[PDB]
Design an enzyme around this catalytic site. Sequence first.
Site, PDB file in Angstrom:
ATOM      1  N   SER A   1      -3.541   9.944   4.560  1.00 36.66           N
ATOM      2  CA  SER A   1      -3.937  10.364   2.973  1.00 36.66           C
ATOM      3  C   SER A   1      -2.677   9.838   2.189  1.00 36.66           C
ATOM      4  O   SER A   1      -2.827  10.086   0.772  1.00 36.66           O
ATOM      5  CB  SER A   1      -4.170  11.880   3.008  1.00 36.66           C
ATOM      6  OG  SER A   1      -2.897  12.665   3.240  1.00 36.66           O
TER       7      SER A   1
ATOM      8  N   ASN B   1       7.964   6.787  -3.119  1.00 38.10           N
ATOM      9  CA  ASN B   1       8.709   7.856  -3.906  1.00 38.10           C
ATOM     10  C   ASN B   1       8.950   9.161  -3.353  1.00 38.10           C
ATOM     11  O   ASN B   1       8.756  10.287  -3.623  1.00 38.10           O
ATOM     12  CB  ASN B   1       7.993   8.024  -5.282  1.00 38.10           C
ATOM     13  CG  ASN B   1       6.523   8.346  -5.526  1.00 38.10           C
ATOM     14  OD1 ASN B   1       5.899   8.112  -6.331  1.00 38.10           O
ATOM     15  ND2 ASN B   1       5.963   9.189  -4.571  1.00 38.10           N
TER      16      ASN B   1
ATOM     17  N   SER C   1      -5.762   2.610  -8.311  1.00 44.82           N
ATOM     18  CA  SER C   1      -7.270   2.754  -7.795  1.00 44.82           C
ATOM     19  C   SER C   1      -7.161   3.342  -6.307  1.00 44.82           C
ATOM     20  O   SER C   1      -7.829   2.869  -5.416  1.00 44.82           O
ATOM     21  CB  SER C   1      -7.807   1.630  -7.934  1.00 44.82           C
ATOM     22  OG  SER C   1      -7.377   0.548  -7.348  1.00 44.82           O
ATOM     23  N   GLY C   2      -5.850   4.092  -5.912  1.00 48.08           N
ATOM     24  CA  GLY C   2      -5.920   4.375  -4.557  1.00 48.08           C
ATOM     25  C   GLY C   2      -6.362   5.709  -4.038  1.00 48.08           C
ATOM     26  O   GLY C   2      -7.234   6.155  -4.566  1.00 48.08           O
TER      27      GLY C   2
ATOM     28  N   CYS D   1       2.204  16.904  -4.959  1.00 49.01           N
ATOM     29  CA  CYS D   1       1.057  17.728  -4.138  1.00 49.01           C
ATOM     30  C   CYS D   1       1.796  18.872  -3.663  1.00 49.01           C
ATOM     31  O   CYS D   1       1.196  20.129  -4.012  1.00 49.01           O
ATOM     32  CB  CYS D   1       0.342  17.085  -3.210  1.00 49.01           C
ATOM     33  SG  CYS D   1       1.458  16.708  -1.826  1.00 49.01           S
TER      34      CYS D   1
ATOM     35  N   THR E   1       2.510   6.886  -2.642  1.00 47.68           N
ATOM     36  CA  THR E   1       3.350   7.867  -2.133  1.00 47.68           C
ATOM     37  C   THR E   1       4.747   7.560  -1.280  1.00 47.68           C
ATOM     38  O   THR E   1       5.608   8.268  -1.413  1.00 47.68           O
ATOM     39  CB  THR E   1       2.547   8.927  -1.184  1.00 47.68           C
ATOM     40  OG1 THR E   1       1.291   9.267  -1.909  1.00 47.68           O
ATOM     41  CG2 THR E   1       3.082  10.117  -0.584  1.00 47.68           C
TER      42      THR E   1
HETATM   43  N1  LIG Z   1      -1.294  13.451  -1.134  1.00 46.24           N
HETATM   44  C1  LIG Z   1      -0.956  12.288  -1.744  1.00 46.24           C
HETATM   45  O1  LIG Z   1      -1.328  10.825  -1.569  1.00 46.24           O
HETATM   46  C2  LIG Z   1      -0.340  12.591  -3.195  1.00 46.24           C
HETATM   47  C3  LIG Z   1      -0.474  13.814  -3.813  1.00 46.24           C
HETATM   48  C4  LIG Z   1      -0.011  13.780  -4.959  1.00 46.24           C
HETATM   49  C5  LIG Z   1       0.612  12.843  -5.861  1.00 46.24           C
HETATM   50  N2  LIG Z   1       1.000  11.624  -5.439  1.00 46.24           N
HETATM   51  C6  LIG Z   1       1.280  10.652  -5.941  1.00 46.24           C
HETATM   52  O2  LIG Z   1       0.389   9.793  -6.624  1.00 46.24           O
HETATM   53  C7  LIG Z   1       0.779   8.490  -6.488  1.00 46.24           C
HETATM   54  C8  LIG Z   1      -0.096   7.615  -5.992  1.00 46.24           C
HETATM   55  O3  LIG Z   1      -0.336   7.960  -4.441  1.00 46.24           O
HETATM   56  P1  LIG Z   1      -1.321   7.499  -3.422  1.00 46.24           P
HETATM   57  O4  LIG Z   1      -1.273   7.988  -2.205  1.00 46.24           O
HETATM   58  O5  LIG Z   1      -2.709   7.632  -4.190  1.00 46.24           O
HETATM   59  O6  LIG Z   1      -0.754   6.047  -3.486  1.00 46.24           O
HETATM   60  P2  LIG Z   1      -1.872   4.577  -3.207  1.00 46.24           P
HETATM   61  O7  LIG Z   1      -1.035   3.558  -2.881  1.00 46.24           O
HETATM   62  O8  LIG Z   1      -3.069   4.830  -2.419  1.00 46.24           O
HETATM   63  O9  LIG Z   1      -2.265   4.196  -4.613  1.00 46.24           O
HETATM   64  C9  LIG Z   1      -1.764   3.506  -5.526  1.00 46.24           C
HETATM   65  C10 LIG Z   1      -2.499   2.671  -6.447  1.00 46.24           C
HETATM   66  O10 LIG Z   1      -1.791   2.243  -7.482  1.00 46.24           O
HETATM   67  C11 LIG Z   1      -2.206   0.800  -7.517  1.00 46.24           C
HETATM   68  N3  LIG Z   1      -0.969   0.349  -8.469  1.00 46.24           N
HETATM   69  C12 LIG Z   1       0.097  -0.045  -8.200  1.00 46.24           C
HETATM   70  N4  LIG Z   1       0.587  -0.567  -9.370  1.00 46.24           N
HETATM   71  C13 LIG Z   1      -0.148  -0.495 -10.564  1.00 46.24           C
HETATM   72  C14 LIG Z   1      -0.120  -1.035 -11.537  1.00 46.24           C
HETATM   73  N5  LIG Z   1       0.967  -1.413 -12.185  1.00 46.24           N
HETATM   74  N6  LIG Z   1      -1.246  -0.817 -12.302  1.00 46.24           N
HETATM   75  C15 LIG Z   1      -2.448  -0.376 -11.583  1.00 46.24           C
HETATM   76  N7  LIG Z   1      -2.511   0.047 -10.451  1.00 46.24           N
HETATM   77  C16 LIG Z   1      -1.417  -0.164  -9.753  1.00 46.24           C
HETATM   78  C17 LIG Z   1      -2.279   0.482  -5.844  1.00 46.24           C
HETATM   79  O11 LIG Z   1      -2.803  -0.751  -6.118  1.00 46.24           O
HETATM   80  C18 LIG Z   1      -3.106   1.568  -5.570  1.00 46.24           C
HETATM   81  O12 LIG Z   1      -4.635   1.274  -5.875  1.00 46.24           O
HETATM   82  C19 LIG Z   1       2.341   8.320  -6.091  1.00 46.24           C
HETATM   83  O13 LIG Z   1       3.389   8.430  -6.787  1.00 46.24           O
HETATM   84  C20 LIG Z   1       2.295   9.537  -5.074  1.00 46.24           C
HETATM   85  O14 LIG Z   1       3.642  10.168  -4.872  1.00 46.24           O
HETATM   86  C21 LIG Z   1       0.390  11.397  -4.092  1.00 46.24           C
END
Ligand SMILES: NC(=O)c1ccc[n+]([C@@H]2O[C@H](COP(=O)([O-])OP(=O)(O)OC[C@H]3O[C@@H](n4cnc5c(N)ncnc54)[C@H](O)[C@@H]3O)[C@@H](O)[C@H]2O)c1
Lengths: 340, 337, 312, 308
Positions: free
Chosen positions: C163, C171, C12-13, C132, C168
């Site tokens: 952001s 990993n 939920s991030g 991304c 993120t």
């Molecule tokens: N620009 C970016 O931010 C971006 C772009 C593309 C892909 N990603 C990938 O997307 C993923 C999330 O990135 P983000 O920036 O949104 O991170 P974030 O920390 O904002 O969000 C992660 C969410 O997952 C939740 N979480 C963790 N373990 C969990 C579980 N077992 N069950 C349910 N929820 C759980 C966390 O509490 C949080 O709400 C990462 O792997 C990142 O590499 C990020």
Amino acid sequence: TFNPSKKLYISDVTLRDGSHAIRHQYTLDDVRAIARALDKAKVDSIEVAHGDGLQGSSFNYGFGRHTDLEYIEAVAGEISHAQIATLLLPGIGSVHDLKNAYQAGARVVRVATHCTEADVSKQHIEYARNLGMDTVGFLMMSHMIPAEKLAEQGKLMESYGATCIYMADSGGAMSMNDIRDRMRAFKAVLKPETQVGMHAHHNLSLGVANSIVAVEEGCDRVDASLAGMGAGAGNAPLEVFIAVAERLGWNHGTDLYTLMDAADDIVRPLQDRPVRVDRETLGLGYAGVYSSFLRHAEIAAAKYNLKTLDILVELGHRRMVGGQEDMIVDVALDLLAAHK
Amino acid sequence: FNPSKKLYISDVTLRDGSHAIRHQYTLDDVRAIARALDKAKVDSIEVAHGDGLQGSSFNYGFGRHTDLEYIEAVAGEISHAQIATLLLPGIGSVHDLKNAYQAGARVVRVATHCTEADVSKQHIEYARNLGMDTVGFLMMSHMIPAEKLAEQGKLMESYGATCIYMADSGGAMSMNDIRDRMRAFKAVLKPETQVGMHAHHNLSLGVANSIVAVEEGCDRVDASLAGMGAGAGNAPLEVFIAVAERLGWNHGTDLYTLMDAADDIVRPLQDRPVRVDRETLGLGYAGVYSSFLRHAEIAAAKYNLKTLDILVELGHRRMVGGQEDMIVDVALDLLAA
Amino acid sequence: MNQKLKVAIIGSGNIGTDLMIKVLRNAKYLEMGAMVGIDAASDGLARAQRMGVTTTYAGVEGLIKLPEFADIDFVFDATSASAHVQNEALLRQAKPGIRLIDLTPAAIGPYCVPVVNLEEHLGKLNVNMVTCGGQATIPMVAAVSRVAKVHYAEIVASISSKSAGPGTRANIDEFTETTSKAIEVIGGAAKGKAIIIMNPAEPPLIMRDTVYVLSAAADQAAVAASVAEMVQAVQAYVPGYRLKQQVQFDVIPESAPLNIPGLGRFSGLKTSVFLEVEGAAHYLPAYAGNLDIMTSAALATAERMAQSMLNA
Amino acid sequence: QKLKVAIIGSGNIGTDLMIKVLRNAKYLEMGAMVGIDAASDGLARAQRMGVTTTYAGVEGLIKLPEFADIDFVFDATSASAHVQNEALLRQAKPGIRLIDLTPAAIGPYCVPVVNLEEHLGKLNVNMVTCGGQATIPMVAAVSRVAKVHYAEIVASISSKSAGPGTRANIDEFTETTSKAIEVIGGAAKGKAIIIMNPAEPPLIMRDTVYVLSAAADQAAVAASVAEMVQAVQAYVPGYRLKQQVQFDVIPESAPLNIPGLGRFSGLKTSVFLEVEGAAHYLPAYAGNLDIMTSAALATAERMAQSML
Ligand SMILES: NC(=O)c1ccc[n+]([C@@H]2O[C@H](COP(=O)([O-])OP(=O)(O)OC[C@H]3O[C@@H](n4cnc5c(N)ncnc54)[C@H](O)[C@@H]3O)[C@@H](O)[C@H]2O)c1
Ligand SMILES: NC(=O)c1ccc[n+]([C@@H]2O[C@H](COP(=O)([O-])OP(=O)(O)OC[C@H]3O[C@@H](n4cnc5c(N)ncnc54)[C@H](O)[C@@H]3O)[C@@H](O)[C@H]2O)c1
Ligand SMILES: O=C([O-])C(=O)[O-]
Ligand SMILES: O=C([O-])C(=O)[O-]
Ligand SMILES: [Mn+2]
Ligand SMILES: [Mn+2]
């Protein structure tokens, strides 16, 4: 209170930061010659990698004449006193690259992040500790945030396992009181046993001055390079720092004349763009721009018919961080459009 | 110290910088440099041979022009800065000073070795009688302790100097040595007496030592474009101004003008680069008078010795400013051994 | 349309919450079933609740127990690469035919970059969305590879620090590795490299991506037109994706080849593409086009999978 | 038999000279030592040797009874003091012989190994300076072999050997020494430099002479130089070369530019001297005192020999 004098740790970065000054074109004979001299001089560590750390060889930063592992293996074969250090920037190099560098001979690793982004260093620092390496946290562009915020990021790397924290003045933008501020902030929050390192750049001519002040404030390790070979106007010039340390009666444990000779007889002749303070490198320090951008901005200046200083001033205004060399062409193209 | 206090910026590119070009500035060189410095609004522009008035000689090197020819050329190009000059008793005389004032000089720095301030009395008196801004300048200021240096400064003040400089002619001092000497001067000079710093960059501390002198209350800073000057050069003016500007100091000059002049006018005039290297670092490490550099290099090339070996032995002999003839004396003694 | 399949979003991030807003607003074959987090105070869960979506802060075991799970056919994972392993494991045992769309760089399933290979893995039960940087830059690598043989391709993605959440930041090595491999597999490059940089500047910076492609000798006009066509194709999904500069070229003569140490001595053409990616500001502001380039890709993949299952 | 003298100025030069008159003079004998400072060490040395002293200056000298028989006055004060000293002494005793050790130079120059016999009948003879007495013999050694276009001397002395009278006449030192390098040394143009160094243990006087002459035979210049060193050693045994004479040929294709003087080629001869003194007053390092005082004494002695 009668106690043994402090032995300074001298960390040479001629074969890593200095890779930027020669556009990553060291030959194997060069690195062997340089490492032999440094090792004879009894420095504590010799840092070896592309200027942007492990796996920095790229279009963005310039390709290396050899790979980091070839350079590390070449240096490992010539030395017996100093340890081999290397630099790793999360986002560019990985833990897999650290494993291969350890296999090649590296025993010290400095995990570098932009000053506000130390939380991306966790896995690399923890892995390096698991490998038994001397594990160091290194905060780039340290003039960009206040001393207490920088110290908090340093304490985070300490919690991951780093046993030494450096501040790197990547833009060569700080003056002596900025160094004092940061050393005091680190000493206030780090464990007493955690070492502190200084990595100054010479863009305002204060590479040695800032290192002297860092030591007067308690720093344990000083990064420097022969003839200042390094990004921008260079790093603190190692032979100069040691000459001053010697005149101050400091316990540095190196051989001054070996370093002075190596700087001008081996290292200086390899320069193709003199590593000095001039209009362009002074512009890096004044604007607080990541020093490795120098040659890439001079190349863009000649390609697009612009003044390098105008490119650097705009990069300063854009608040770029380490690794953002692709924004140099962006700025150059935008300056051409603006002028039209 | 207050950052709003106006600093006095004294450029020495056309006097100390004369050592770097072996006193071969052309008249167009000095007009171009003076024009840029004046546009930048520096407070003074110093003009003379490197060893001051009547320094042209076999010992120090002959000039391409006389001092008065250079002063006259510089006078014709400027309107903001004053012309300063340097006079060393034992080399230049009051007669030479009189001629320099008639050619346009308004500031005279009367220079003596740090322990010999009493030889400046007549020159200082004569300068005050012409109504010039009269300055005492102590060479080789690392050689004696701060309290002794301040005593010599007080002697020059007593003769009539209204500004006293310490010159780190060997480029051998670090930042705490500057604080010690500034504090000693301020403890004994009259409150109105101006203090000036003249750093050399042999240990890469030209700017650092100048910054500390100002933090300690110094009023005037000597510096030169690209550090053009003896040894590894003087404090590099464009670098000092860039730092002062970042610190919010009232330096009163135009940084951009200085940066362009340093690299487009001055740096291209160098043949032997003005930088910190084995030989110039040797000057600072051994505490040797910086103008000995090119003469030591000349002797090294003639007698096939390492320049550094000559400079380290000069340091052991404890020579003072003006003793270029002992450079060959040392070279010959090294070959005898 | 009217008959939609239900989805869950785990994470939920930044990414998960931007993806939920896109499902809510724009999905045609899919509708929100549940938003799943592990932090009761998460902003994304609060946002899910205000928009009427069922939530749980009991992770993937919590999702598997909701009443709504019986009707969920798709799960988008926006947690972290390490958590995806366990997430896939659990979901697969609870519901063998569930479709997992991985937005992390774990890459336990094959890569999908819609403008290049959307149709390829529509029958797979675990599809990976690269990163991304990958979604923004692999289309430009493919744009060159369809004109000339590509020897090496390098991408540099720069995003605002704010952001990039903790997911993120846990990993980053997988970001470089997965993106590099996908530049080769999907982009057609013989060798790939990927760099990611975070910059905390204020006002926050718009995502920038720079792509450097070394190909054999090729017609510059043809490469530029192919790039332009590909930019138009990505824009059908993400309107704010655009060139920031014209495509730049450097010819590399065989008489003066470029040495890439240990890889080769190459000649031909260097193509440099400078992109910027503005997002729709569904969750974070418009500078965070790094969320959009991934979430729009993930939603397009699941939407096409759903379309295919509802209309053969 | 021997004629009586007064020394005015009881400093380093004046006191060294007194000791030489006492021990070595054959035609002269001390009559009085005259100063202006009762605390002057030289007046105390004089009293210990039985020599009449006064701290009332030249005025006091004349009032001295000893003055009626004093035929020679040596002036070791300072150049401005000397014009007044000449004035008052000439009035009071018309034929008194003045030997000027200051750079005032109102009388002709005498450098004994070059022109001792020339001014023996003059009533005021100037002895140039210590730098001039040490280096004019070298300039002259080159000039008797070849035409000299320019000659320059660098005198470095210990700061402790330079009293206040020396320090107050430094400009006069350079001007008189440069004129004497021309007039007596034979150079078309001269220049003189004086440097004081306070190093401890005090430094021996050093003098470096650079001479630009027309092309010449180097062995002949070196031989002339060696003969002149021997000539000076007859007066001051500690005068000697510190190095062999050094040479540099200045080719006609790359002449030296002396600004406002001209462009010259030929031969550059560099002579490196050191001058050890007899330690009559200050220690042996202070050969700058001896090179002057032995010359001054040799001049008056020769004059006194001829008066008879
Ligand atoms: N620009 C970016 O931010 C971006 C772009 C593309 C892909 N990603 C990938 O997307 C993923 C999330 O990135 P983000 O920036 O949104 O991170 P974030 O920390 O904002 O969000 C992660 C969410 O997952 C939740 N979480 C963790 N373990 C969990 C579980 N077992 N069950 C349910 N929820 C759980 C966390 O509490 C949080 O709400 C990462 O792997 C990142 O590499 C990020
Ligand atoms: N190596 C040398 O020191 C040196 C060598 C050669 C010639 N000289 C010349 O000799 C002179 C003396 O130099 P010094 O080093 O012996 O200086 P000094 O200060 O040691 O001696 C000068 C003496 O003259 C006395 N004096 C000053 N004014 C007087 C006056 N009006 N009447 C009487 N006594 C007076 C002083 O009290 C002192 O006793 C100077 O003109 C100097 O240029 C000096
Ligand atoms: O890494 C570098 O070397 C730095 O940031 O200055
Ligand atoms: O005169 C000066 O230039 C010196 O002493 O540094
Ligand atoms: Mn660096
Ligand atoms: Mn100087």
